[PDB]
Amino acid sequence: MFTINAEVRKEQGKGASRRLRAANKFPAIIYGGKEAPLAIELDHDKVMNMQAKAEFYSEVLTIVVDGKEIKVKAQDVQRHPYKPKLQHIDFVRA
Amino acid sequence: MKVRASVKKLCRNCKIVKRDGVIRVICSAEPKHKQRQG
Amino acid sequence: MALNLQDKQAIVAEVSEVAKGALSAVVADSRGVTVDKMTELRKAGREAGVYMRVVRNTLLRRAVEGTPFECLKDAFVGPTLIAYSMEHPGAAARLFKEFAKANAKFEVKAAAFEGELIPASQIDRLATLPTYEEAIARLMATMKEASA
Amino acid sequence: AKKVQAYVKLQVAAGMANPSPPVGPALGQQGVNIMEFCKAFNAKTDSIEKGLPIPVVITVYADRSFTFVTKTPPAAVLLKKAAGIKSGSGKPNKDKVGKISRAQLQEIAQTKAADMTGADIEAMTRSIEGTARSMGLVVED
RNA sequence: AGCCAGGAUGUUGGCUUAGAAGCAGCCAUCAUUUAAAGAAAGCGUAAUAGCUCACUGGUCGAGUCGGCCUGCGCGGAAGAU
């Protein structure tokens, strides 16, 4: 049971995302069901380690945001084109 | 002495040592293997 | 080395011999050859059968791992190399004697005969453990003390 | 036995200790005597068996007179004169064709129990199985 | 990491070769005594022999190993008044 920690994103866009990336974090989003899509940041290092394991993508994961466990499954992942790095993650509610 | 841009351990015995700001391969076993960076 | 389901086996046999055993000797095999242990094989072989085992275990988590249970005085006989020779069926027999006679032929050493745990001492090569079945020496003076 | 000196083991003859082509002068010349190999070795050869290879070890140093010692037969050649096929194979080790006996491979190992580390008598027979399966001889146990 | 030990057996695996015995190759890459010992990684040879190595047991008695990310530096770097 992978448990990710996350913060809700104040500012969204191109510049903001870049800034986030620079500061060892990276954006991500949750979407699925009736509930509205939730944009979050994630600490990069923690998540990269997690995603090395193939069980990360198959199993259900738990994102903690504002002290609230959302159960999601990793739908898609943007990787950096020539680095071991994550640009962005799409999580789907489960 | 081989003096190369690319100096490498060529065997188990070959050891790399920097002396006076010069990477050098010194090998106890084989004289041919001894190298210098240049 | 394995993990933890293999090292215990050695201690299991160690404790088993340490506890369920008797008089034991020592053989500091600092440079064991091939005939050194081979000569002991025959010596140990004589004693009943294969009960006088003598493995090369001198680790604190090996031969000293089974010291808390029985033979609680091998902490001083645990340094360097100490080949505990725990016995089994019988008692002391000639193990100590044989060991002394086998260690007097320059067979490596034995840490100055450290000794195991039987009486209430430490190092003491005694020869009062040899005869333990003789019962025909009391039938030699009966046909010579009758005429006179 | 605790110390050794020189030793040149070689399958010699017990019937008549006087070879030439096989051994002869090559059995002893570095201080060894070939005249003391047919007056003592034969003495302890007419009280057992003579005819099959008998490896011998001469305890010669530099004091001329030496001390002839005995030995034992090979366990690998014990499945030739006390089993079946003498060769023990015949074709390249790839197709098992050899065999042994379930009633044997136990009393044939008791004869050479003076060179077995196996404390137990049945423990020495366990090593025979591996020596009797060198090529893969399948026994009918 | 050094230091002390072993580093066996079937076995010198067979061939083709002049010879081939771990080490010319070509090929199988197995089993034994098991603590562990490659039908053998290097040296060595007429080839054996011999000298190392792999792994493993002891001594010792705390950290150690080599990838990833990035900062700054080193070599690569020879021209004419």
mmCIF file of C-alpha atoms in Angstrom, chain C residues 136-145:
data_model
loop_
_atom_site.group_PDB
_atom_site.id
_atom_site.type_symbol
_atom_site.label_atom_id
_atom_site.label_comp_id
_atom_site.label_asym_id
_atom_site.label_seq_id
_atom_site.Cartn_x
_atom_site.Cartn_y
_atom_site.Cartn_z
ATOM 1 C CA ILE C 136 39.104 -59.493 35.988
ATOM 2 C CA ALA C 137 42.051 -58.097 38.036
ATOM 3 C CA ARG C 138 40.411 -59.394 41.277
ATOM 4 C CA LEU C 139 40.575 -63.022 39.975
ATOM 5 C CA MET C 140 44.398 -63.406 39.621
ATOM 6 C CA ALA C 141 45.172 -64.072 43.334
ATOM 7 C CA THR C 142 43.103 -67.182 44.297
ATOM 8 C CA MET C 143 45.093 -70.192 42.933
ATOM 9 C CA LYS C 144 48.388 -68.968 44.523
ATOM 10 C CA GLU C 145 47.218 -68.093 48.094
#
